[PDB]
Each structure stands twice: as C-alpha cells, then as structure tokens.
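User: I'm writing a short report section on ligand binding and want a predicted complex to refer to. Could you take this sequence and chloride ion and write out the structure as tokens? A short remark afterwards would be nice.
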Amino acid sequence: IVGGYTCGANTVPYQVSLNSGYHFCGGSLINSQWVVSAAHCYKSGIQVRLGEDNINVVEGNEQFISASKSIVHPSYNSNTLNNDIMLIKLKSAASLNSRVASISLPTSCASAGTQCLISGWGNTKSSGTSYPDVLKCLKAPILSDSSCKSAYPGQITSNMFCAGYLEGGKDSCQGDSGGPVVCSGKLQGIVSWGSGCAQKNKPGVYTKVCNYVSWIKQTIASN
Amino acid sequence: CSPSGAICSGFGPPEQCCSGACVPHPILRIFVCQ
Ligand SMILES: [Ca+2]
Ligand SMILES: [Cl-]
Ligand SMILES: [Cl-]
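Assistant: Sure. The structure tokens for the complex follow:
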C-alpha cells in the first residue's frame, strides 16, 4: 500500500497473508474455513496466516493454517485478467475471535463514489525497495466506470472496477494482490492489477466480487 | 528454487528464485522471479 496509514493491530480482522515461506499475497477471510484471493495468486503449498499485524514478528494473535484446496475461477482469463478470483479452503477451521473475523459478502454491487478500505503488506513506495512490517490501510473511492475505461482504454471488463486516486501516490501495490477492498462492511473488491502503482492517471483495478457471490456460495457448498 | 515467472515474495531472499532476482511485476500486484 502506497500513501496509506498504519491500520493498527488486528483492526482489519478478516485480512490474511498467503505464505509460502514468505508472504506473497493477501486474502480475505469469508468464513471460518474459506479465504477469497486473486486467481493470479494461485500456487501449491500455501499456508494462510490469520491474525497478523507485524508480518515479521510473532505478536501472539496469529493462526497458521495450511490450505487444503485452492479453487481458481473456472473462467479465469490470464490474458485479460477477467475473473481474477480464487477460493482457498483451510485444512482446519480458524478460531474466530475479535482479532480473527470473517467479512460479509456483498448483497449488491457498490456504486461509484462509495468509499472503501484497502489493505495489505505490499510495497509502500511506488519505486525502489520497501521494508513493510505492520499492515497498511488506504481509504479510496470507487471510480466511475467511464473514468476507469478512460484510464485503461480497451482493458476494463465488466468484472473489474477502478478505485483510488488519479493524482498519484495513493494505491495498492506489489505484494497487495489478493487482498480486500471493503466498502460499508462488505467485500466488494480484490486487489488485482494496474499500470505500476500509484502512478498519475492509473488507479488500481480490482476484481468486482459482487459478480461472483453465487459462484462463491456454490464452491463452499460443494467442497 | 522457483523458475522465471513464478510468484515470489518481496520479503524473501534473492535465492527464492533460480535467477536470483525477485522483482515487482509491472502489472499484477505480486512479485515474480526474473
Ligand atoms: Ca506476526
Ligand atoms: Cl507471517
Ligand atoms: Cl473471459
């Protein structure tokens, strides 16, 4: 996250880290056994880390649970990034508490201008080497679909929205992939892509979760 | 070690990757092996 602020320990209790030795993607806890992340975060040997604040230091609220299943959306298109969503099942249910909590799925799509919380342990600078430790947060509005298409002509699908700022310096960034965009207490987005990060006139592009609720429910039920 | 194009970690050492470089992807918000 570039141009954001320190969240505070466990103030984003649905934020998880996908780990393979080291953190490599974010994700969102949607019930005690399931995490939502990006299809492009798919790889074998994932451990989910819940209750993290400082990702480098044990603070006492962590749960470390192996993934048992990783289910990429069956229409994920790695060429266009359409349908960039994955579900991960935990090998055992997480213990839910004030610091480890699920986030609700949306009941409708959010409108342009809706303010959202984006979070993660990604790079905090738009160029060069970052040294993140604690979870970072950014408040960012959903942009109009027309301004989104204007920023990325010929590249925005109906399963994406832009969120953030046109002026630069405030955005999600590398290492934030798969993490949450939450608006009014609902998970509306997944950190996906952009032209670099925090660049002028190139806001972040996010998977539009509201289009996947039935697929999410079906995948949970059948697995 | 992970092949070129594999996902890797901005927190991890260069030896994550066979190529010895784990770099930010230009588009996706992950790091990948050079
Ligand atoms: Ca920790
Ligand atoms: Cl960790
Ligand atoms: Cl498609």
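A remark for your report: The radius of gyration of chain B is 8 Å. Residues A 75, 77, 80, 82 surround chloride ion (ligand 3) (CB under 6 Å).
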